[PDB]
Design a binder for this molecule. Sequence first.
Ligand SMILES: NC(=O)c1ccc[n+]([C@@H]2O[C@H](COP(=O)([O-])OP(=O)(O)OC[C@H]3O[C@@H](n4cnc5c(N)ncnc54)[C@H](O)[C@@H]3O)[C@@H](O)[C@H]2O)c1
Ligand SMILES: NC(=O)c1ccc[n+]([C@@H]2O[C@H](COP(=O)([O-])OP(=O)(O)OC[C@H]3O[C@@H](n4cnc5c(N)ncnc54)[C@H](O)[C@@H]3O)[C@@H](O)[C@H]2O)c1
Ligand SMILES: NC(=O)c1ccc[n+]([C@@H]2O[C@H](COP(=O)([O-])OP(=O)(O)OC[C@H]3O[C@@H](n4cnc5c(N)ncnc54)[C@H](O)[C@@H]3O)[C@@H](O)[C@H]2O)c1
Ligand SMILES: NC(=O)c1ccc[n+]([C@@H]2O[C@H](COP(=O)([O-])OP(=O)(O)OC[C@H]3O[C@@H](n4cnc5c(N)ncnc54)[C@H](O)[C@@H]3O)[C@@H](O)[C@H]2O)c1
Lengths: 462, 462, 462, 462
Amino acid sequence: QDYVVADIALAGWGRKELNIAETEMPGLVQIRDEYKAQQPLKGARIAGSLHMTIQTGVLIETLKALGADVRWASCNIFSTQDHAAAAIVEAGTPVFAFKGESLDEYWEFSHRIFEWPNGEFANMILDDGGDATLLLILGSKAEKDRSVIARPTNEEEVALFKSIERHLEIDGSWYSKRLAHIKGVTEETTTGVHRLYQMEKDGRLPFPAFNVNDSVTKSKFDNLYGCRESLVDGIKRATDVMIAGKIAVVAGYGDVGKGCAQSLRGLGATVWVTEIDPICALQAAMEGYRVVTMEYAADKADIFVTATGNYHVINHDHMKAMRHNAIVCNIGHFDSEIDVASTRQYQWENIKPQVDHIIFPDGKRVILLAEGRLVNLGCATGHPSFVMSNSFTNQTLAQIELFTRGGEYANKVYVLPKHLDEKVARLHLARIGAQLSELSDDQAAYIGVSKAGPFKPDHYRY
Amino acid sequence: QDYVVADIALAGWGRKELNIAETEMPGLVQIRDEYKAQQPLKGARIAGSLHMTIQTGVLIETLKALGADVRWASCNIFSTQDHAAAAIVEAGTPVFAFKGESLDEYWEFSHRIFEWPNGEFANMILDDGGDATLLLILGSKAEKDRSVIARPTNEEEVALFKSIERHLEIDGSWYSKRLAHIKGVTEETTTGVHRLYQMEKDGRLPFPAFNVNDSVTKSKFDNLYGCRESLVDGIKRATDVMIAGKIAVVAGYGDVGKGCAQSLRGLGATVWVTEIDPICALQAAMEGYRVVTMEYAADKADIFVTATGNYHVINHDHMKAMRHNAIVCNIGHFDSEIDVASTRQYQWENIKPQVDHIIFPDGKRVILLAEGRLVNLGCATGHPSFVMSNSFTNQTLAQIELFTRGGEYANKVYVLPKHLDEKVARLHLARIGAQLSELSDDQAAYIGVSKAGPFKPDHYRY
Amino acid sequence: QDYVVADIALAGWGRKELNIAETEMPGLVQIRDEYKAQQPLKGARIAGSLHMTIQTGVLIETLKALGADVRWASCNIFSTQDHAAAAIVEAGTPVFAFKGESLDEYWEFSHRIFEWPNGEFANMILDDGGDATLLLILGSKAEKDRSVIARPTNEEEVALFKSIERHLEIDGSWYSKRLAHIKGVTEETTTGVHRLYQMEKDGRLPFPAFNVNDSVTKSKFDNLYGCRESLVDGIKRATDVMIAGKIAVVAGYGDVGKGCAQSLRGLGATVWVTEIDPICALQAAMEGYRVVTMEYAADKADIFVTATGNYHVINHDHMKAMRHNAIVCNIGHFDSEIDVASTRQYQWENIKPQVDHIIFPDGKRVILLAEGRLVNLGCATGHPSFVMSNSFTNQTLAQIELFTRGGEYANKVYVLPKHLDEKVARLHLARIGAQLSELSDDQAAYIGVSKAGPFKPDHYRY
Amino acid sequence: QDYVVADIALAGWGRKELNIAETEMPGLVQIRDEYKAQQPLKGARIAGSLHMTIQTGVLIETLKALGADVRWASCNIFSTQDHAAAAIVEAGTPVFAFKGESLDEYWEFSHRIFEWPNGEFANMILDDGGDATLLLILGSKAEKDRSVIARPTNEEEVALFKSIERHLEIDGSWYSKRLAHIKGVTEETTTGVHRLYQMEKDGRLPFPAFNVNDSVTKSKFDNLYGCRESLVDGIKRATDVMIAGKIAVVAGYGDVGKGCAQSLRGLGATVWVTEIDPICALQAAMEGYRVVTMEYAADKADIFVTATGNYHVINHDHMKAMRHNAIVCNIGHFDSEIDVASTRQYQWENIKPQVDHIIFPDGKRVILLAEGRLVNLGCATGHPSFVMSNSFTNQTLAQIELFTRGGEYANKVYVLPKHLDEKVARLHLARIGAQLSELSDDQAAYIGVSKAGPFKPDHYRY
Ligand SMILES: NC(=O)c1ccc[n+]([C@@H]2O[C@H](COP(=O)([O-])OP(=O)(O)OC[C@H]3O[C@@H](n4cnc5c(N)ncnc54)[C@H](O)[C@@H]3O)[C@@H](O)[C@H]2O)c1
Ligand SMILES: NC(=O)c1ccc[n+]([C@@H]2O[C@H](COP(=O)([O-])OP(=O)(O)OC[C@H]3O[C@@H](n4cnc5c(N)ncnc54)[C@H](O)[C@@H]3O)[C@@H](O)[C@H]2O)c1
Ligand SMILES: NC(=O)c1ccc[n+]([C@@H]2O[C@H](COP(=O)([O-])OP(=O)(O)OC[C@H]3O[C@@H](n4cnc5c(N)ncnc54)[C@H](O)[C@@H]3O)[C@@H](O)[C@H]2O)c1
Ligand SMILES: NC(=O)c1ccc[n+]([C@@H]2O[C@H](COP(=O)([O-])OP(=O)(O)OC[C@H]3O[C@@H](n4cnc5c(N)ncnc54)[C@H](O)[C@@H]3O)[C@@H](O)[C@H]2O)c1
């Protein structure tokens, strides 16, 4: 069995949910129809490391419909949907992923996506978080200098370092010969992208890399629209609270905060915003939101939402000043936006999964969601498929561009070209009934663009 | 054991949830504090027939805190929350309710709320749907005319009639004796209020009844704000679908439909509305919604919501014209807004509990929610506590008024007096931080009102 | 010349503006087309007393297209548009109206609409404010008892009383014989309607009267939609102020205040509301508005809008606490919502017409619009034609109903029947592209209405 | 008299309006207070060419309060407010501007800002549209090559070239001598910035230039918020039309179109959008607007707004398909968004100033605003002061930076540094009551920024 999944019997269920997801992921489905004849990924052998969910499944089969051969693993030990994995295997793709897998299994499975049968090699990486890429790069270094895997600080490292030693025993140059076949990497997260920029700095980047995280279509959907669609859903599943008439404070008015504010206001909450950036604060104010400090908000608001990407924006003294049964949640950085640690010295009482009462020295209670982790993933189900369709359609056009024209690119990190970012948007228009107009020749000349785009300058903010 | 519940062990859990709910139900709690000293319900013996949930538990303990003696049953066989029932019993109230009870047990439990110890009788009814009222009125007539309980249309009538026949054997004047002791009824639903108006018309109403359904505070919260708060919640739990960019059609632009349109629009849907009432249609047009026909919408919309209270507003031929994986749901009348029965001829495939695929001959599928029953109750959790607080504060003030001043009233159906309706609203203001202003003497005279209210004429529409 | 206008030469201009207004008044234009064949007003001789504007002109010619003969005057000395009057005369209708006419001329012109040539008599009154109706009723009394015009308090009375004495000299029973021919009155304002209710009380109402002021379509358009369309326009014409980011306080959250709040929020103002009615306050709160006292708002808000219909809701001490260059206006009762009188002791400095600086003892200035009169009429141009189309379409269907079936009605004040209120709405649907649906027989029975309406019970609030 | 204005008598009026405007322009006023002591512009001699309005007067006196010596002209022959010019002259600034001046007078006035007394020279240019900059650059080249001012395309060039030829006769090196003294230019318009980038490309830029057009604060206020605030204002002054229930189409969904759509929707219009950019189109779809074609909209919409910056986006055949009395206007490029010229073949009829009927052969009419020029400027009063405060605070900070630190800059076009852009926003917060928060040291390090800013990376889109 060239796969490791929870239970292949879950395949039929997975296929039914794939069939449903496809309708909500028109960008991916339309790429299949458009590039059918050309088979642009014929000859591509893609190693993929990305949350093994139903939506990722639609991406896998798009890559296959375009001609790719694919091996897949999850980028997280808990994010796999076992029935999705099952259905993808049943359809003929090696998957090494199950929910609740150990760290040892995680790093093993990250090797498996790079062990192709019949003397073959992966020639593309599709990554989320950069673990797959990190494995080849660090393993290659360990070949020359074992010391780099000699002193593991944490738990993830013990498992990573150990897995590398195990493969160096199979083949003393296990990693470098595999790295030599990679034609391109496409990466979609902030952390993965930071890692690539550092490799480039260190002269350690041996192929072109596409930063897809910073495209307009990916960032708007992943940040603004995705969280707008999901904040209130998580709050309601957890608490069933009435939103109308409540004071809700959103910390941060970037893309995530903008979406949060908009959804809360759409239900009749009074929305306050906190900010450290005066441009963002002024944007919030021009939408009729009151811009306040968290000190001011702390004893007044009913609902607190953190969207700053920063550290301890809701702190011990804020919570201490809070109203009884104030609801506190986080939709920003995966942790530490709220100082949950500083409340651990007080009585807690579980209300239900991902919902807890914290009881302060005076008997005043606060309701905390997902233990200060991401409310949209802990109390709801994360981004809807249409949102993920925009992210994954980016990843797909990036794979096509590097596999197909990667020789035109240096061994550097590149943001997706505007014309492909525009194409991502265009691929989603028919689903939602939007009719795109066309410039005439005179009009294209008049505003100084090609009829085919790109339509805006690189500095354009949308 | 003067109670029948699922499991008395659930009491501690129920008490924890009651403690949470109280903070979201300020009308009930503030009533407890305001009327504490007066104990206006001392000497009241209330037979209640109302969904035995955590929220109803808060109402029950409010009635008790005001001096009432109380016995309770559910008005529905499936709506009971067993931990709620348990906590209320443990706190000293007879309850006759558990989730999933039978129709035989249902009607028996309806008798038990009228069986008081120490030779005492119920003197007040707090009703939802009118079953408690019906039992006594039908049963009383059946004492002198067994023909009324002779021809059961219906599985519910079969159970009802049996229980009457069974009690007639114990005492030929079981109902009669009890009916004569009722000083008043308070009723909060359309169905219950229709039954009362019909009794009044027939001269069969032997006590004053308060119609609390048609109060402004009750109708607004129960119809408009409640459904606004919970429509999308149900759709998202069921489907996790992206709302932005979708065409959603709402059939009906009354209170319910107004709330629906408003929540869908708040998330970036294009909202279309159908209507038969030109006034309601013009209202919709003035908020920027296109007013369309269901025939026009059938093959164009992505989301269908029925809010008409009418019959087969989505029919077989509409569903057949629908777009593949269109979502169809009902938030209006309990059933028959959608012609679900006409699709039973087709293969169905369950997606998950309360979510079904209907497969048409050409392979096109429709996603139907809650089998065409109520999506906010089937796929979500129903109205939030603050909403129910408005309905139940209406019931409480109605009980106080009829118990303490019923002599002032005739044997008719009255809508809650405007000043009590205003009181319901007022009791909810402190929670949401709304500061009410006071008229001066000059100002009250200038507009022709008392400083204490009521503030509007009886025909005022708000 | 059976007319008195400013200048008949203005007719061509007026006709051009009539032709423009008709497109925006589909209710009136559609009545013409629908009732063409029937000529329901053939035999009607309508005396009309209503602001002689372009929009009223479209009403006059609708009445004529339906078969009426008409004589017209203004209900206000300043509201006439001279080119409208000119165009209506040129088309063959006697008009007695010009802007800036004296009180003597006003009362003379009110007689002229009741002096028909060739021994004829008016048999219908179309009134706004009840002056026309008052003339006949009071004149009739003076015939029997001169004392009722013996002691005039004010300026309007001196002119009224004098005009009556003058006509009693022509014909000692000038009024009563004219009153005897009136088959019906239709009245559209609050004041006019109060006067009718008082006549009825006093047994002094000799014909049926329609209160059109309280119809749903007239009240929603005249109160809510009209002021929503126009508040910000008046503020901007006067001040050119940026609305976004300002705190704007609306006193009152009835129909006018509701519209005001909604328009201000639509431009990104932070909107606060004050209220004395807790139901209205709770409505405001459920839309996310903060409900505050004027004492709280006075030193904080940038923009103050009064919509209460009450007395001195913005008072001396409020203005004294105001921020420098706060803008103060009134869209409610025609005066005394603001205590402008109490500021008259302080320096004023005109900024431009209808805009004044008030300079307080400490040098802090406030900007007052229209001297505390109606901002939408003083700084903008009042209600748009579509709004007036709803009012006047009411007046027209009321005229048709009383002329045509007035024998079915007692000599009482009646609100317009719901089926005619619905018809008003329906007549406006085609213009705005709204497609009204139709009940089937089964559906009409199911919800208990006729297919033709009315569709809602009398107590329905919309 | 070192000035040329319409009437110095208008000065007191102008001063009154300047005093009002100041309260709505907190960025300029707060700059005066903050930099008072430092007098950073002491030694600066600023030649300004910018619309001589009341708002520009506030900018001028801010520059003076900071130590600058200043001479001023308008950048447009018709934009001058004569009372503003007068007040600024009376307060001691040479101004060369009056409303309705000729092109000959225009260019002469442009020379006068460069003629300083006591043998001194301008050392800074504050420009709008780039005419002041062009004069010196073109004129300098013309000294050594008279061919550049030999072939005038254009009535404006005829005037420009004459004035250069006239000054060349007085001094063959008139421009040269002056050009060499310029330390910097600040430019705020698209046209001016394009000219600067073209000079830079040709190596013809002898000093650092700040592009203030593309700052976030300038572009947002000038493009989005400014047009949002004033679109409907213009339409209503022109037509007094009802907006609710109308279909309004906005061509373009960039900054301007985004603001338009938002204001129209806020009043209950159904808003459709056209676009050629799929990203912008998806943005519109995500806010619930239908994205349509102008061909589809042509015969359906009631209101047409062009915001594309493109050429003939409304053409002859669109207008011919339009609904009778459709309103057509342009808020985008100064002209040629609508093919007005193609309708000159038809009879026109003026409705009023800036409002015209275009009469088609079949008698169908279209209402065109401002003859297809800018409706916010033609039918209203342009941007409000708070908006202009953001543009002019940008200019002020740009002047301070180039004057005090220009040595740090090369002879290129720079966009305003992000930290100054942030400063513009910050300076506007106190007015609107927005409370900015401060990062702690730990928080600044955690997200990788200085506590003082800048807070975002250069590619951040807001
Ligand atoms: N929950 C999710 O599923 C999800 C999805 C996408 C992104 N994110 C995360 O959300 C976070 C924010 O994302 P974004 O795209 O909005 O980033 P952003 O940088 O665009 O916006 C963050 C905002 O927070 C403000 N801020 C920083 N510190 C603050 C403080 N101490 N107080 C008040 N405001 C402060 C900044 O000025 C900034 O405008 C990131 O960590 C991102 O990774 C989460
Ligand atoms: N889901 C819930 O939890 C919940 C809560 C409250 C009320 N309701 C129910 O929702 C239904 C509607 O309630 P409401 O308060 O909005 O009633 P309503 O009478 O105020 O509104 C119903 C609207 O539907 C329109 N309508 C009737 N038949 C139609 C048809 N064939 N096509 C288009 N429109 C049609 C009517 O003209 C009307 O204006 C009722 O059955 C009510 O009991 C449900
Ligand atoms: N400006 C116009 O062109 C125009 C058009 C229509 C109506 N009106 C007038 O506007 C006024 C209001 O009309 P409406 O239809 O909204 O009336 P309404 O009675 O429906 O609403 C008035 C509201 O003001 C509140 N109120 C009374 N005194 C108050 C106080 N002291 N402080 C705060 N709130 C207070 C009341 O509770 C009420 O809800 C009336 O005088 C009406 O004639 C003006
Ligand atoms: N009226 C004013 O006072 C004022 C103020 C600021 C800017 N503007 C002007 O408005 C215009 C637009 O400004 P912006 O900042 O929105 O520019 P922008 O580039 O941000 O937006 C223009 C939009 O129009 C779209 N477009 C181009 N041709 C089109 C076509 N044929 N059909 C449909 N869409 C088309 C583009 O795709 C684009 O996204 C510019 O000319 C600008 O100078 C006017």
